[PDB]
Ligand binder design. Sequence first.
Ligand code: KRV
Lengths: 553, 403
Amino acid sequence: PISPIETVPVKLKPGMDGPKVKQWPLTEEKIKALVEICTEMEKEGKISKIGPENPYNTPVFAIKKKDSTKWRKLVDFRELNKRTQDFWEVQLGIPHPAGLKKKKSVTVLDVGDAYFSVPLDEDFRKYTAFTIPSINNETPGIRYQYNVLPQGWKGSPAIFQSSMTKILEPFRKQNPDIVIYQYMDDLYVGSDLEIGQHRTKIEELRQHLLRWGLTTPDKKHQKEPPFLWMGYELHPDKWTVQPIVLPEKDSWTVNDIQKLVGKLNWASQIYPGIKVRQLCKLLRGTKALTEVIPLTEEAELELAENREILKEPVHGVYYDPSKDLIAEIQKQGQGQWTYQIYQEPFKNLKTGKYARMRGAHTNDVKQLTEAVQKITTESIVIWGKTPKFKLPIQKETWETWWTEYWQATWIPEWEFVNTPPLVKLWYQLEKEPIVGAETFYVDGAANRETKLGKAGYVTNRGRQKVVTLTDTTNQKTELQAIYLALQDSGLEVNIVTDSQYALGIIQAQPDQSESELVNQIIEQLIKKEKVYLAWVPAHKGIGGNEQVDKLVS
Amino acid sequence: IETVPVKLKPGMDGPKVKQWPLTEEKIKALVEICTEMEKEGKISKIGPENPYNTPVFAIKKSTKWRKLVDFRELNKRTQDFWEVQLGIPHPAGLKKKKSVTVLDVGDAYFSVPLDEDFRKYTAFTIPSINNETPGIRYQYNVLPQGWKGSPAIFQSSMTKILEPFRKQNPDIVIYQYMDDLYVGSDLEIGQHRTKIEELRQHLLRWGLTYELHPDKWTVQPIVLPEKDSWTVNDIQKLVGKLNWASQIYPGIKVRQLCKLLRGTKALTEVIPLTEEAELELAENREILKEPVHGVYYDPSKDLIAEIQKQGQGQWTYQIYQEPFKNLKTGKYARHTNDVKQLTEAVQKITTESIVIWGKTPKFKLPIQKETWETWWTEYWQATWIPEWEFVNTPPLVKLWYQL
Ligand SMILES: CCn1c(C(=O)c2cc(C)cc(C#N)c2)c(C(C)C)c(=O)[nH]c1=O
């Protein structure tokens, strides 16, 4: 049928006019097939015969469907689409299984001929004109225009969805007890009535859909659980991802490793503790998909650890709105984090992974807070409320951090949980200068064109030491000078620098870095008893700064 | 009533800012609110043929949820209309007043119809949890709150409403900014408050149902300690701070002081102060107390604001148009909640900014984008929203503005 629902007014982009492409001449079998299709469509109202004056045209083609002897009408809307107005996004975000409430009864209803079942703005139809060419194009062709939403036109998915929304609206007002998800040309319907009163509410729905143009499957043609949907397996009171098979291979190609990582990432939605750091490392660099990459030993270990987790099947449960959400996070290692969200321990709604580095240098407290933040956003999306957290960090460790760090922060309600490795601070710079501790006035300096560098220091006990660095930046030398003062000093040491850059880095208490130097400074700062770091203005003739500044050049 | 044609700035198109995820309780509050405004004909449900979108949020003022539409983009895109075509003049006498009361007159706007051809640009979306349904989409049929066009358009009705009250109190300064009325006088506080009630009654006959003290507003000068014995470290921190000042305040001198830091000395060492250093130090403290020489407000330029977290519930801020040329610097203090405080400091700063310049600053915020994105709404009470970005504070700057 074609829905009686009022049409959505459509227009072209303001500067523009509708397409006027020329019809490519087509073979005889194709012209035949197109005529057969169009005549059938025309008799259902889908399209109408026109003749010029209508100036517009969009090319039509016919393809031979798979191996079968069926033909299909393909229309190339490229130009009309470029000239058609933008619409609002159809649906931004898709439901996650973990967010569904458990239902006593669920039914899937797919709309038949969804697009062709919805009218097109009368005033817009004329821009959809296409022409079936005569044999070798010797005579005038047969011209139609759409009365309904064309396949492949820009506005179709959006106008359809809004039509379904308007049509569904009343049944929703009258049936709050009933849940309906709109996805594409599907309806998913659930309630907590017993079979009978549900089977009954369905038919009402269907019948309402029918008054409105939309045909739907009958009791006998409704699919049964488990439903497979967008990569998931949806059972009556649980869900999981669709079955994942890690390929056995002697030799892995880029393409194979990419697909493997994608499957792992997908699996990590509900399989706890999936990791892909060591695999992703392989993907770094620039190669073709066809290239074989030898698995490193750590990647080989990783695939193995994943292989075992995937061994026995896991599932997630659905959301009970009357209980709180709890989220647990664990450190999995080098910048890697995993989490689980449950309501009853330890039956997970879902699980997940966090890796991203924010900057070149951070520490676990920063990283853990980034993961709390990422999990909070996701939980608001899926459930509409923030979880209660259980974190591998003492409350006192976290408050020491927050109070003395310069960036503001605030994680929602959380508790300590003793699930090592725990996140801790690995050193703390002194807050005051250390009496009886040797003061190193350090400095670095590189020549811009040469790339030659020289890092040194001077102390108040008269020590001095300069070293040369090759192919170094004006700011690498400033870190070297600090590393230098760290390894020649005692367990207590004050260091004076004029590098805000170096100061900024160290003052944030990094415990990991992309930089080898910074990784070395860190190992040092941990070995120490007390380090106090101070900053001075360069070239102001201040104290020992003048001296070590002279030594480097 | 006859509507006012509204033109976007030529070329550029309307807003298409995505909606942020909202919690269930805020969504529900928004549905109620919007179902009611639709009954009252202020908004209407819209189709997919409307490409545009601006964000909406719910704030809690009172224990009544309120709707806050984020028109930052639209305003930026309509700026020719509300600023150059129908600009509202900012009184310089406002900031001189003993007391300023801020009144919300946003209800005024719901009675004036919005230009038919402009309505599509006010589109917004109420989201749904887990994307169960498509958003609920509306646009405005009347002057929306949050849009800088609404006061621009409504102003001449505002002038009529206020004309008697102005005539009768010629020394009272009234300034409209967005959804707000700013009312300043020099009266004693009881009389000032009496005058505000009198004003409310005027407003009340036209369907329009806290105290600032701008005098009390004074610099947060960069403060040079007054110390007992000075260490090398202490003088080093003093030079660094004065070296910062010298980018800003003409006349700052450092020679006499750093003469003290001679050789390669231990940081903890106590070094006595020169006759000259102490004079220099004194002459510099004079300079920091006063306003910056050479820095002036350019009305064509944007205002910027930086905030440093000082710890212990203290927060410093500076306002400028070009970096380091400070028009104002200040302090806000006193939650063990960093985001709650930061939120307070931004609203306070914005408010002072509106009183002084008639402009909202763009903020440089010392916080991770996503954290702020998730939480600012829990504590926000203002009806406008400044522009902001997110910054890592240089550890130096924070130290130079400490107290
Ligand atoms: C059984 C899974 N389920 C479902 C559901 O059956 C469903 C859900 C989606 C998103 C897609 C598909 C398909 N194909 C099916 C719903 C429905 C009524 C939303 C619900 O409420 N609660 C729920 O546990």
